[PDB]
Design an enzyme around this catalytic site. Structure first.
Site, PDB file in Angstrom:
ATOM      1  N   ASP A 186      80.843  47.336  57.528  1.00 61.25           N
ATOM      2  CA  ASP A 186      81.018  45.983  57.504  1.00 61.25           C
ATOM      3  C   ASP A 186      82.142  45.347  56.973  1.00 61.25           C
ATOM      4  O   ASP A 186      82.748  46.095  56.227  1.00 61.25           O
ATOM      5  CB  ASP A 186      79.626  44.818  57.494  1.00 61.25           C
ATOM      6  CG  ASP A 186      79.011  43.934  57.558  1.00 61.25           C
ATOM      7  OD1 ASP A 186      79.954  42.988  56.966  1.00 61.25           O
ATOM      8  OD2 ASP A 186      77.783  43.501  57.931  1.00 61.25           O
ATOM      9  N   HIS A 201      79.200  38.921  53.969  1.00 64.23           N
ATOM     10  CA  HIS A 201      77.978  39.465  55.076  1.00 64.23           C
ATOM     11  C   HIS A 201      77.205  40.627  54.703  1.00 64.23           C
ATOM     12  O   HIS A 201      76.097  40.707  55.690  1.00 64.23           O
ATOM     13  CB  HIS A 201      79.089  39.322  56.352  1.00 64.23           C
ATOM     14  CG  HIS A 201      78.381  39.268  57.826  1.00 64.23           C
ATOM     15  ND1 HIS A 201      78.648  40.522  57.881  1.00 64.23           N
ATOM     16  CD2 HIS A 201      77.876  38.578  58.312  1.00 64.23           C
ATOM     17  CE1 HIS A 201      78.039  40.609  59.515  1.00 64.23           C
ATOM     18  NE2 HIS A 201      78.133  39.616  60.141  1.00 64.23           N
ATOM     19  N   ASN A 241      77.088  36.116  69.317  1.00 64.69           N
ATOM     20  CA  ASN A 241      76.521  34.728  68.528  1.00 64.69           C
ATOM     21  C   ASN A 241      77.948  33.465  69.834  1.00 64.69           C
ATOM     22  O   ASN A 241      77.080  32.473  69.531  1.00 64.69           O
ATOM     23  CB  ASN A 241      76.705  34.079  67.792  1.00 64.69           C
ATOM     24  CG  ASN A 241      76.256  35.364  66.021  1.00 64.69           C
ATOM     25  OD1 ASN A 241      74.863  35.447  66.882  1.00 64.69           O
ATOM     26  ND2 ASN A 241      76.989  35.555  65.188  1.00 64.69           N
ATOM     27  N   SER A 251      73.962  39.332  63.674  1.00 64.24           N
ATOM     28  CA  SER A 251      74.343  39.943  62.690  1.00 64.24           C
ATOM     29  C   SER A 251      72.825  40.242  61.490  1.00 64.24           C
ATOM     30  O   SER A 251      72.913  41.373  61.233  1.00 64.24           O
ATOM     31  CB  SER A 251      75.491  39.916  61.738  1.00 64.24           C
ATOM     32  OG  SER A 251      76.618  39.728  62.736  1.00 64.24           O
TER      33      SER A 251
END
Ligand SMILES: [Ca+2]
Ligand SMILES: [Ca+2]
Length: 269
Positions: A32, A62, A153, A215
């Site tokens: 990430d 994130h 998404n 996520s």
């Protein structure tokens, strides 16, 4: 004061905790934007594959957030992870803008396989296929890593890369009514779903934030996989993957939900 995020309860992680399973001795790579030091996290190590970002700290947020869903510590503060004793490794493959290259992602997957990670959480995507990506996935998988990835998404009826590749476990997102979240990508290749709406977790700055996305769903599954591996240390990546699907709560069409909602209680019975 420690709080338990709704998603952690929905996948029933505390039932597993009550059986003594917390992910102890399980190595989990978070691929990430990095992971920041935080009072409710323990980071065991990592690597950066971002050009000119030699540290693994998180300049985005994130990755820290994803990390806390997996392994926020069991204590008197913050939140609680699905697998709060898992050994967390920060593998930085995305830049501060939350973006990276397939080159970076592939190097991260190579490192995870090379350093004996049990689980690799990929809360990220590419809209377009990449041979390099699929071979990286395949590589980690044959080394024995279990690769878990977000479906995406965009809301479309197809799922992003590398989730769409066979050797990656594809995770979509559900809401508090256990319906598919409107943004969650679905279709061919979807394996399972998990909470992805209003997910509170750890954030840089020694703080906590609520985010939405596939996520946020993915780390619930990564976490659940560490619980199954603590209970069954000789099981393969493939046995764990199959057992999670086999024990998930069925939500309707597999097109939309995969096997359904991850259930850490049922998977650790
Ligand atoms: Ca905590
Ligand atoms: Ca897949």
């Amino acid at each position: 004061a420690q709080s338990v995020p709704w998603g952690i309860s929905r996948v029933q992680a505390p039932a597993a905790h009550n059986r003594g399973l917390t992910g102890s001795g399980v190595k989990v790579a978070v691929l990430d934007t990095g992971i920041s030091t935080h009072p409710d996290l323990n980071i065991r190590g990592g690597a950066s594959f971002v050009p000119g970002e030699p540290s693994t700290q998180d300049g985005n947020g994130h990755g820290t957030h994803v990390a806390g869903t997996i392994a926020a510590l069991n204590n008197s503060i913050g939140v609680l992870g699905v697998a709060p004793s898992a050994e967390l490794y920060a593998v930085k493959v995305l830049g501060a803008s939350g973006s990276g290259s397939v080159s970076s992602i592939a190097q991260g997957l190579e490192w995870a396989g090379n350093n004996g990670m049990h689980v690799a959480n990929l809360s990220l995507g590419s809209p377009s296929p990449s041979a390099t990506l699929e071979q990286a996935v395949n590589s980690a998988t044959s080394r024995g890593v279990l690769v878990v990835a977000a479906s995406g998404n965009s809301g479309a009826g197809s799922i992003s890369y590398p989730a769409r590749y066979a050797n990656a476990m594809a995770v979509g997102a559900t809401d508090q009514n256990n319906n598919r979240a409107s943004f969650s990508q679905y279709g061919a290749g979807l394996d399972i779903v998990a909470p992805g709406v209003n997910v509170q977790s750890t954030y840089p700055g020694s703080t906590y934030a609520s985010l939405n996305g596939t996520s946020m769903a993915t780390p619930h599954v990564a976490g659940a996989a560490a619980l199954v591996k603590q209970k069954n240390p000789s099981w393969s990546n493939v046995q764990i993957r199959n057992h999670l699907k086999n024990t998930a709560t069925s939500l309707g069409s597999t097109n939309l939900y995969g096997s359904g909602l991850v259930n850490a209680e049922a998977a650790t019975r």
